[PDB]
Amino acid sequence: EGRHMQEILDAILSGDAASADYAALALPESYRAVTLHKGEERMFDGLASRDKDPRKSLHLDDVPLPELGPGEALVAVMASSVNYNTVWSSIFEPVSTFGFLERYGRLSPLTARHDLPYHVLGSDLAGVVLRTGAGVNAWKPGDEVVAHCLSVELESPDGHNDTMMDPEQRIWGFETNFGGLAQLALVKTNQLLPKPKHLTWEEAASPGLVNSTAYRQLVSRNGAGLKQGDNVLIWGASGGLGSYATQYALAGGATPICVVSSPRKADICRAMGAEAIIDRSAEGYRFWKDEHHQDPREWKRLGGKIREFTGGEDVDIVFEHPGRETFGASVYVTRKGGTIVTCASTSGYMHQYDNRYLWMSLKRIVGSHFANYREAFEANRLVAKGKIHPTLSKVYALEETGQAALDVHHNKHQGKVGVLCLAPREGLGVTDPELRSKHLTKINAFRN
Amino acid sequence: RHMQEILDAILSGDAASADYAALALPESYRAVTLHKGEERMFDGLASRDKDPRKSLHLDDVPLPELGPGEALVAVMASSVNYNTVWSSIFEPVSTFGFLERYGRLSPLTARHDLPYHVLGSDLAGVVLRTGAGVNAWKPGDEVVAHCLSVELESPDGHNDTMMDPEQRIWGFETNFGGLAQLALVKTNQLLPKPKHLTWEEAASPGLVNSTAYRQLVSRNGAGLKQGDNVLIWGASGGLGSYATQYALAGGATPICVVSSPRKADICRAMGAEAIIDRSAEGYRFWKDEHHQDPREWKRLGGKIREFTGGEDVDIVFEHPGRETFGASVYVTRKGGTIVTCASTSGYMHQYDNRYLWMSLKRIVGSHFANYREAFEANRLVAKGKIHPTLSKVYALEETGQAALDVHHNKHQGKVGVLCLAPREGLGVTDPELRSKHLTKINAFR
Amino acid sequence: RHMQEILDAILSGDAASADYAALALPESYRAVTLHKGEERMFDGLASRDKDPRKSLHLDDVPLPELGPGEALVAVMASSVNYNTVWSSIFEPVSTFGFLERYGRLSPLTARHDLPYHVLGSDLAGVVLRTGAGVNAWKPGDEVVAHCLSVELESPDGHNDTMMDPEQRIWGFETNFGGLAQLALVKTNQLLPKPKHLTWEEAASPGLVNSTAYRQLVSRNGAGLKQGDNVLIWGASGGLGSYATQYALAGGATPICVVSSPRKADICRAMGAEAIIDRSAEGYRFWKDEHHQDPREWKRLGGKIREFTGGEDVDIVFEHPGRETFGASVYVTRKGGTIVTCASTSGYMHQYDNRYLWMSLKRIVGSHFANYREAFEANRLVAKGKIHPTLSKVYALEETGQAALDVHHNKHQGKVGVLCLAPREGLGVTDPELRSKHLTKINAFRN
Amino acid sequence: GRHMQEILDAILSGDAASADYAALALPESYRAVTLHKGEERMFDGLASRDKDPRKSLHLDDVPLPELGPGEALVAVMASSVNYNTVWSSIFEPVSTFGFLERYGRLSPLTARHDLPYHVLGSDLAGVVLRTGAGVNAWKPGDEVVAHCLSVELESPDGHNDTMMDPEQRIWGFETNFGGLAQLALVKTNQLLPKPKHLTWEEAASPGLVNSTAYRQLVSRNGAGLKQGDNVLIWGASGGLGSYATQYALAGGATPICVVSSPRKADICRAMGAEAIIDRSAEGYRFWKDEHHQDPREWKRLGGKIREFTGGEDVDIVFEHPGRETFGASVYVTRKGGTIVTCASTSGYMHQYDNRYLWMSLKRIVGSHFANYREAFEANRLVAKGKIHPTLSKVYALEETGQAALDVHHNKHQGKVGVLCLAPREGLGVTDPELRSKHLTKINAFRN
Numbered sequence A: 001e002g003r004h005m006q007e008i009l010d011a012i013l014s015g016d017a018a019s020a021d022y023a024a025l026a027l028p029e030s031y032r033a034v035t036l037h038k039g040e041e042r043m044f045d046g047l048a049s050r051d052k053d054p055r056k057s058l059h060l061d062d063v064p065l066p067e068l069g070p071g072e073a074l075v076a077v078m079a080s081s082v083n084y085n086t087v088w089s090s091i092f093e094p095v096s097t098f099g100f101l102e103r104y105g106r107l108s109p110l111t112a113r114h115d116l117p118y119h120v121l122g123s124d125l126a127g128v129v130l131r132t133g134a135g136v137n138a139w140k141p142g143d144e145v146v147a148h149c150l151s152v153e154l155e156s157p158d159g160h161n162d163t164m165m166d167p168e169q170r171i172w173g174f175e176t177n178f179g180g181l182a183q184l185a186l187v188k189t190n191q192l193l194p195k196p197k198h199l200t201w202e203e204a205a206s207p208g209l210v211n212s213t214a215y216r217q218l219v220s221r222n223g224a225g226l227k228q229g230d231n232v233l234i235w236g237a238s239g240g241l242g243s244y245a246t247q248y249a250l251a252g253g254a255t256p257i258c259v260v261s262s263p264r265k266a267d268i269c270r271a272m273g274a275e276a277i278i279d280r281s282a283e284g285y286r287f288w289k290d291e292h293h294q295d296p297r298e299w300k301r302l303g304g305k306i307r308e309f310t311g312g313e314d315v316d317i318v319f320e321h322p323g324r325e326t327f328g329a330s331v332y333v334t335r336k337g338g339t340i341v342t343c344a345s346t347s348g349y350m351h352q353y354d355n356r357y358l359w360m361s362l363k364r365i366v367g368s369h370f371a372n373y374r375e376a377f378e379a380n381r382l383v384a385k386g387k388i389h390p391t392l393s394k395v396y397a398l399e400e401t402g403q404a405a406l407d408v409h410h411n412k413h414q415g416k417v418g419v420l421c422l423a424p425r426e427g428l429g430v431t432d433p434e435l436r437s438k439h440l441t442k443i444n445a446f447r448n
Numbered sequence B: 001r002h003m004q005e006i007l008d009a010i011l012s013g014d015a016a017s018a019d020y021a022a023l024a025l026p027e028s029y030r031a032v033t034l035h036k037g038e039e040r041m042f043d044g045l046a047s048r049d050k051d052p053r054k055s056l057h058l059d060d061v062p063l064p065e066l067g068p069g070e071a072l073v074a075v076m077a078s079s080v081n082y083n084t085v086w087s088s089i090f091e092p093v094s095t096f097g098f099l100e101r102y103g104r105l106s107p108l109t110a111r112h113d114l115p116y117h118v119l120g121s122d123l124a125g126v127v128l129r130t131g132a133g134v135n136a137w138k139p140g141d142e143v144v145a146h147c148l149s150v151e152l153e154s155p156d157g158h159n160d161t162m163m164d165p166e167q168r169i170w171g172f173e174t175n176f177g178g179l180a181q182l183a184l185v186k187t188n189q190l191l192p193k194p195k196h197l198t199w200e201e202a203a204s205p206g207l208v209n210s211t212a213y214r215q216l217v218s219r220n221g222a223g224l225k226q227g228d229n230v231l232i233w234g235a236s237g238g239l240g241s242y243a244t245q246y247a248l249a250g251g252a253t254p255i256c257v258v259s260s261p262r263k264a265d266i267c268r269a270m271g272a273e274a275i276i277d278r279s280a281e282g283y284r285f286w287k288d289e290h291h292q293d294p295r296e297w298k299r300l301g302g303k304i305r306e307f308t309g310g311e312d313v314d315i316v317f318e319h320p321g322r323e324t325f326g327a328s329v330y331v332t333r334k335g336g337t338i339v340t341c342a343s344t345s346g347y348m349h350q351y352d353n354r355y356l357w358m359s360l361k362r363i364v365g366s367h368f369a370n371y372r373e374a375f376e377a378n379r380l381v382a383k384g385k386i387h388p389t390l391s392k393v394y395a396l397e398e399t400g401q402a403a404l405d406v407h408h409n410k411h412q413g414k415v416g417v418l419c420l421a422p423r424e425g426l427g428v429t430d431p432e433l434r435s436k437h438l439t440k441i442n443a444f445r
Numbered sequence C: 001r002h003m004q005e006i007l008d009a010i011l012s013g014d015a016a017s018a019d020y021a022a023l024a025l026p027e028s029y030r031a032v033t034l035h036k037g038e039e040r041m042f043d044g045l046a047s048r049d050k051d052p053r054k055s056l057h058l059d060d061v062p063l064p065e066l067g068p069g070e071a072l073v074a075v076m077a078s079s080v081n082y083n084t085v086w087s088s089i090f091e092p093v094s095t096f097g098f099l100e101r102y103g104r105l106s107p108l109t110a111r112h113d114l115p116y117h118v119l120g121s122d123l124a125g126v127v128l129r130t131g132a133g134v135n136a137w138k139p140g141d142e143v144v145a146h147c148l149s150v151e152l153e154s155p156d157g158h159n160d161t162m163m164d165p166e167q168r169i170w171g172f173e174t175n176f177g178g179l180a181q182l183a184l185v186k187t188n189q190l191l192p193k194p195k196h197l198t199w200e201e202a203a204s205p206g207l208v209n210s211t212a213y214r215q216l217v218s219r220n221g222a223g224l225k226q227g228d229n230v231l232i233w234g235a236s237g238g239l240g241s242y243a244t245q246y247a248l249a250g251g252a253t254p255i256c257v258v259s260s261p262r263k264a265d266i267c268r269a270m271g272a273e274a275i276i277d278r279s280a281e282g283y284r285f286w287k288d289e290h291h292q293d294p295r296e297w298k299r300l301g302g303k304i305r306e307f308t309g310g311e312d313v314d315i316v317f318e319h320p321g322r323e324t325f326g327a328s329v330y331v332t333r334k335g336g337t338i339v340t341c342a343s344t345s346g347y348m349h350q351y352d353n354r355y356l357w358m359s360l361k362r363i364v365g366s367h368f369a370n371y372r373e374a375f376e377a378n379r380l381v382a383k384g385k386i387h388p389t390l391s392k393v394y395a396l397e398e399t400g401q402a403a404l405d406v407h408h409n410k411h412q413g414k415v416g417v418l419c420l421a422p423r424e425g426l427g428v429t430d431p432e433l434r435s436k437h438l439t440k441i442n443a444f445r446n
Numbered sequence D: 001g002r003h004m005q006e007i008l009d010a011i012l013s014g015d016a017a018s019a020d021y022a023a024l025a026l027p028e029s030y031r032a033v034t035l036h037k038g039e040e041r042m043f044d045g046l047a048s049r050d051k052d053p054r055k056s057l058h059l060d061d062v063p064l065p066e067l068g069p070g071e072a073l074v075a076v077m078a079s080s081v082n083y084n085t086v087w088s089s090i091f092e093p094v095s096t097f098g099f100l101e102r103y104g105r106l107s108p109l110t111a112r113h114d115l116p117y118h119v120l121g122s123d124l125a126g127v128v129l130r131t132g133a134g135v136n137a138w139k140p141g142d143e144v145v146a147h148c149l150s151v152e153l154e155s156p157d158g159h160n161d162t163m164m165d166p167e168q169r170i171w172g173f174e175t176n177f178g179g180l181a182q183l184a185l186v187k188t189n190q191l192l193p194k195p196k197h198l199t200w201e202e203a204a205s206p207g208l209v210n211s212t213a214y215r216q217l218v219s220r221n222g223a224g225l226k227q228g229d230n231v232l233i234w235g236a237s238g239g240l241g242s243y244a245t246q247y248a249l250a251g252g253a254t255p256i257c258v259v260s261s262p263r264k265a266d267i268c269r270a271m272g273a274e275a276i277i278d279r280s281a282e283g284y285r286f287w288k289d290e291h292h293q294d295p296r297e298w299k300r301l302g303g304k305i306r307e308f309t310g311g312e313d314v315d316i317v318f319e320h321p322g323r324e325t326f327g328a329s330v331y332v333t334r335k336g337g338t339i340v341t342c343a344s345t346s347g348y349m350h351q352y353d354n355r356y357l358w359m360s361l362k363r364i365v366g367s368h369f370a371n372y373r374e375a376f377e378a379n380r381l382v383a384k385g386k387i388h389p390t391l392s393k394v395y396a397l398e399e400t401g402q403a404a405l406d407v408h409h410n411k412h413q414g415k416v417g418v419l420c421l422a423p424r425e426g427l428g429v430t431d432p433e434l435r436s437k438h439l440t441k442i443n444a445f446r447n
């Protein structure tokens, strides 16, 4: 385990270590981390994406601690989660992350710390601050934290009216090194948020990435600007993003039309409170009739199915992310004047759509990407208030991150797949038991 | 003759509203018409070989009955645009089909269901009579027209009438259009005539001007602000020419795209300086029928950066569609907007969504303009910030030739038509403002 | 009576459109009216002592001529609104000035310029006739009506009809209002009657619910989002009874202000938890007639923070005006919004602009709702997501006392008025949906 | 000082490379205009107008501060004296040392600013000499001006618009090492590129008033101006109003300029405006007494505006005078229009008739200063030659006290600049063609 690392974990588990105790703990010289290796980035060349196996490319390595810099924190990570970006990274698609690290390392000697022949992955965490760098006053050793994954330098003026517009804006653990699928992580302190006290470590680590994105994409004025009464088509409603978009639609007074591909996922949507659920596999939609042409009759068939649930109304908003396969239909079925908001292209990023439906019906396609610190704060605030709930289905140990990534790669999962890092077992970290007890049924709605 | 006395009063310049209210209406007026019986005369031909001179008739027609909230206008000039051309060759379908269907609705809509169709979706002229409830307009008022008519019985359009589900283009999906000596319009289509322009100039900006205004200037489109860089496709064409003028008048920089040196010269006459000739540059955005070439998106992006000092455009003014749309999405600045109101080259758009979401761009659909936007666009013409783009004017009897000229893209700017006006150059009552702007007013001649 | 035959047709429940078209129109109808010769009758009185019972008359009036784009409606029920009170005490100015100005536009608007004013800005009922150009509505249609009157001849209103320069409020700046057996409206005022509600229930939301929707929910007002904290003045009155519902159903947190424990109980019945009784707290925002007390602003702000865990509200839902408006601006969060549609306590607002500009706040003026917003607000009632808030119902002949109730702030929720309806409880045609929501529907009942 | 002279020689030569600046030895002191902590009570009992900045401002040699992460050391060629600088120099509303001391408790880095002297100045134009750790976008030799807003952004509040940050500092006012000195220390996210067609002192002039007017009038966080709009602009030849007038014209809108003298009206015409109201000549009396306004005077203003607009009411009112004018501002605004306010010069207790606000769906939008993106865009429009500086008079660094007195007593119609390292006026232009095109408007406020 390592003596210094074990002493850090014992401090956390004791429950009554003070900030000065964490400050006095000796730092280990290495930590265990899930990594990619630069020499292997071509190992899947010529394969179909589905045949690329994250278990072959993900390694469990001992890596040295990076040097702590200004505005940063070293964090002892109790738990993290698998995200799709973890899957993209592990199959080197659409491009290898080592290209991101190389470009990032050119900015300054500080960013050059990230340009290494291994890539520590992971874009969520829940844990405890161990150290803070120069200029940090809002966070201190011992603070229980979750982290959002926005990395912004904010030297350029572009990001000072919404930090997502920073030209050097990046995603921590994907376009930067020292991610959260490890025993320790390095983050900017303007990634830190207070851990929800009613959640376990693994529950608390599970919402950060997808919940923040869903909030900006659906709730905020920088995305679709949902209002009560809206009809919202939610693709992938029982996956990572969808498990929060569906909660936002319902808690916001809108009507979600949830799309899933199994009756088990349909049951979860009903457990969340949704009533209008479409099983795209039962319906057998074939939006593309061959490699280059779509089928407008299948767009219309989806549109008619939506109208069955809404009493003849077309959706005000489409919550997109599947990309090429569904995007033509998404644009077609949207109400006149409505919005398709997209943050991803899982099935393929070369989108095709019929612009007659977009311009003649005054629709818009809004590109959305993660969330600024304020939006991340607001999304985590709603979790802390028990208004939005974690969606954990299954938890793996850190050593099993390859199988966890394979689960998501092959769409075998529901909700979020969590990963224990330093936490020795599930169930630890709750310090608000009465709030937990109030919401326990919903907290566990995605569990196997 | 009653029509001649109307024309004499207009030409005198000093007739009063009561004088117009006292003039006796003619029993018929001269109009450019389609005939119901001929709607198949072009069957089998390619579109380019359909000759509007064969289908367009110069007839004497009776006056429609004036309804509530309508105006009878004495028309001094009008215009020929692509809509007029398509109707004149019965494309995509005969206009009589909609006139008949909608004419089943009520005795009011049935007025338009006739065996002839008076075409024309622009006018500049003088109000003669107004229907019941009209408050804003009276005989003698000098007017141009916004061609979009809405009934607004649905709530959908009451926060922006472009969301109304039942729009009609006057002179296309209605009868009694502007290519005639008289016309019938709703009073909430009327706009004040710019005083520094001639009749035919005032009738010219019309729908492409208000469409460009909504798409580029208004908050329902791109919401231009001074300092913005704007890529403007087809910058000497209809939409692009007004877009270029709006960019300059708003304190922004147009990056104008055209396909010939003559068109570049016209952009300079409008006041632009950053001009890209897409054919001289040889852009091949598509490699074959199914795959684009991102190296060519980037080559365009690098050329844009030559004019802007390294900056990428805040706004792309789109309308070519499939050929250009992938490049438009690529070159747009992080957080920027691609606004689109047409897809000339093809409506099946393909683009790389990684650039759109990773750089938080948006594609905003826009269509025509609501009446407030049409008013603001015409008001910027009236202020002398935006100028008409006439190349050539025909007499009413020659409307067939005017339509063929548009059909075969014979002029760089717009084609006007004199209706009652006996010659070009009449109707200016602000000679001081006109003198200031004469060179730009004539930039397309 | 031709009127009795119309009512019997409605009460039968199975008359067809053709039957309504064949019914003879009566030559007069009963109407609550003001009289032009009386607009000075309250000279020298304090507003409180002006009595709506003295100024409101029950008259037989002739039917107006039906014009293009209009509908003659048989009115089963209506409601009292505060503009009914304002009208009846001729404050801040006489409505006859509005009618005189309106009548100058055209011979059609001149129909409204009469020596009597038929009041009422809500209705639920049945269409009898439609004018020229009307295809979306026909006789026999069961309707409620919003009170926006827009002519839409000017370009100004074609990107949001509230900006029409000739925009008016039906029954307040126009004649032939809904507190009568018949009413004349534009057909673009008509919305489908919620089928699970009685006539009086269906007449009660229209005006205040539409306004609260534009003011709080829509992008033309405050643009509420879930997680917001919202200060709601008058939370158990007409506007507040809908604003509180929109806050809760939209996922936000209302801080409800009321002035009695009885009203606090209603707020809790609606689902609110953070309730401030301004009478129990004894706020005195004004030291005297010209100066406010920033210590009292701060005391309100501190009380709000007790409910929100130290957070200041994102939105203030204003309408009390002078008395509260300085506090509303002070307590709002940095970057937040004060949205106002009224000034009940006085329209000369005073506030400290340092708090507005240095904290980048905004004051958004809001007025009624365009047709799309009114449609959306009625849609949420029809879907059973927003509920009527009727507390008491009066017969048409007692409209004077109904208005006095509101004038003196003795009511809660909405006070309804029966017009043609001979009693309460009629008009439900969706009993299954009604039973699902009946407990909430009755939350305001005495 | 030899090292300081070598730095100035490099700048004046015009062709020093970045590596040349990196190799220049730093001086161990620099000349600076300072306040002294022990003198903060020297004006007690006096009326503000009689407090003399020439008595409180010192010309001192001071040591260089330690350069921290994300900071730059700048060789200052020119600076400015604004109202903020004047207030500091007379210890109003309180002594600036109070904040420097409290904030200096936070950390060793904030404590660098807690000193017995305070180097003032919230504008600069100059050349980057050194950059601290992590800096990417700036290097030695870069020609810069500064945005004076300093934010640490540890709170999430300001990450959708940094003006919502709860803990801003105005550099040179709530920080030390200001611009009225030969050297200055700023955060690199205060730096902006110097407009090449302007002199050092001209480039330092637009500063905060220009970017505040930009946010208030042009940006979507303020009034969101569009071409064709009619804009009522109070105080149109003053600081805020002069830039607002230029933004209105540059954006294709019509400014209706309000001033109080014929000489001020001439300046508005020099800027390119035509619609000008002299509020003193018209004799507006919006307030009848201390407590009641005169709506007939609101209407008289409204009628005068209509004379210039062909009968239209303004889409936007650019407010900042406050109590005296704010009732009229709300009344005359068009239905659906916006009153934007960023100050209350005449009094912050605003009174207005809310019937006009809600019945015509108007709004009052508070704006304050500018975030760094808005400051970049405002300076960019100066660099494009759309917006011009408004300098009236320039003093040498040694005369900064008299410069501050001139501003304190409103001696000039435009701005007062200060030469720091620059040995004379007129240096630093590297785009003479663009300057020639705009020379007349550039000098509109001389002298």
Ligand SMILES: CCCC(=O)SCCNC(=O)CCNC(=O)[C@H](O)C(C)(C)COP(=O)(O)OP(=O)(O)OC[C@@H]1O[C@@H](n2cnc3c(N)ncnc32)[C@@H](O)[C@H]1OP(=O)(O)O
Residues within 6 Å of the ligand: C082, C083, C086, C091, C092, C093, C147, C169, C207, C341, C342, C343, C368, D299, D300, D301, D302, D303, D306, D313, D331, D332, D333, D355, D356, D359
């Ligand atoms: C749905 C439930 C609703 C509720 O329950 S909400 C609570 C109940 N409701 C209330 O409490 C409010 C009741 N209503 C009122 O209090 C009054 O109507 C008030 C105060 C709103 C306006 O009062 P006005 O004085 O009538 O308005 P104003 O504009 O002064 O009109 C006369 C015009 O002054 C001129 N003029 C205008 N602007 C300008 C300008 N910028 N420059 C120059 N001249 C200007 C002319 O245009 C002139 O026209 P003319 O030359 O005469 O043709």
Ligand SMILES: NC(=O)C1=CN([C@@H]2O[C@@H](COP(=O)(O)OP(=O)(O)OC[C@H]3O[C@@H](n4cnc5c(N)ncnc54)[C@H](OP(=O)(O)O)[C@@H]3O)[C@@H](O)[C@H]2O)C=CC1
Residues within 6 Å of the ligand: D083, D084, D209, D234, D235, D236, D237, D238, D239, D240, D241, D258, D259, D260, D261, D264, D279, D320, D321, D324, D325, D342, D343, D344, D345, D346
């Ligand atoms: N918080 C901060 O850090 C700062 C705040 N400020 C504030 O913003 C300022 C305004 O900016 P600025 O433009 O640079 O100041 P200026 O002195 O340069 O311009 C103001 C000109 O407002 C006009 N004005 C003043 N008082 C009245 C009135 N009662 N009625 C109508 N017009 C009036 C005058 O113009 P005219 O007589 O010609 O009509 C005045 O010359 C302040 O007055 C100040 O309160 C300034 C600096 C820093």
Ligand SMILES: NC(=O)c1ccc[n+]([C@@H]2O[C@@H](COP(=O)([O-])OP(=O)(O)OC[C@@H]3O[C@@H](n4cnc5c(N)ncnc54)[C@@H](OP(=O)(O)O)[C@H]3O)[C@H](O)[C@@H]2O)c1
Residues within 6 Å of the ligand: B082, B083, B208, B233, B234, B235, B236, B237, B238, B239, B240, B257, B258, B259, B260, B263, B278, B319, B320, B323, B324, B341, B342, B343, B344, B345
């Ligand atoms: N829905 C309606 O009722 C209606 C009515 C009129 C028009 N429209 C539509 O909107 C029209 C555009 O309006 P418009 O008046 O501006 O037409 P226009 O005057 O003919 O100019 C538009 C052309 O766009 C450019 N262009 C065309 N094809 C291009 C391509 N493949 N790649 C790059 N640029 C291309 C420009 O040319 P260069 O770069 O070659 O110089 C310009 O000629 C569409 O053509 C379409 O007809 C619709």
Ligand SMILES: NC(=O)c1ccc[n+]([C@@H]2O[C@@H](COP(=O)([O-])OP(=O)(O)OC[C@H]3O[C@@H](n4cnc5c(N)ncnc54)[C@H](OP(=O)(O)O)[C@@H]3O)[C@H](O)[C@@H]2O)c1
Residues within 6 Å of the ligand: C081, C082, C083, C207, C208, C211, C233, C234, C235, C236, C237, C238, C239, C240, C257, C258, C259, C260, C263, C278, C319, C320, C323, C324, C341, C342, C343, C344, C345, C366, C367, C368, C369, C406, C409, C413, D358
């Ligand atoms: N512009 C529009 O479209 C529109 C639409 C509807 C109404 N309105 C207007 O808003 C009105 C209120 O309308 P409403 O229908 O809701 O009337 P309402 O039923 O009487 O409700 C108002 C509530 O405000 C509170 N209140 C009254 N005076 C107050 C004061 N001085 N300070 C604090 N709170 C006070 C009372 O609540 P508590 O005593 O319990 O605190 C009362 O329940 C205005 O006067 C007006 O007519 C405007």
Ligand SMILES: NC(=O)c1ccc[n+]([C@@H]2O[C@H](COP(=O)([O-])OP(=O)(O)OC[C@H]3O[C@@H](n4cnc5c(N)ncnc54)[C@@H](OP(=O)(O)O)[C@@H]3O)[C@@H](O)[C@H]2O)c1
Residues within 6 Å of the ligand: A083, A084, A085, A209, A210, A213, A235, A236, A237, A238, A239, A240, A241, A242, A259, A260, A261, A262, A265, A280, A321, A322, A325, A326, A343, A344, A345, A346, A347, A368, A369, A370, A371, A408, A411, A415, B357
């Ligand atoms: N830009 C950002 O900030 C951001 C943030 C998070 C995620 N993302 C991206 O967004 C994508 C989804 O992320 P996630 O965490 O939600 O992953 P996820 O847990 O796997 O959920 C995706 C869901 O999409 C559906 N789906 C998958 N392929 C589909 C297809 N071809 N057609 C229709 N539906 C399909 C759902 O399944 P069923 O219909 O089968 O039930 C699946 O549960 C990923 O590409 C990820 O990289 C982007």
Ligand SMILES: CCn1cnc2c(N)ncnc21
Residues within 6 Å of the ligand: A299, A300, A301, A302, A303, A304, A307, A314, A332, A333, A334
């Ligand atoms: C052709 C009719 N039609 C138009 N839009 C749709 C739709 N979304 N869904 C189904 N049918 C439709």
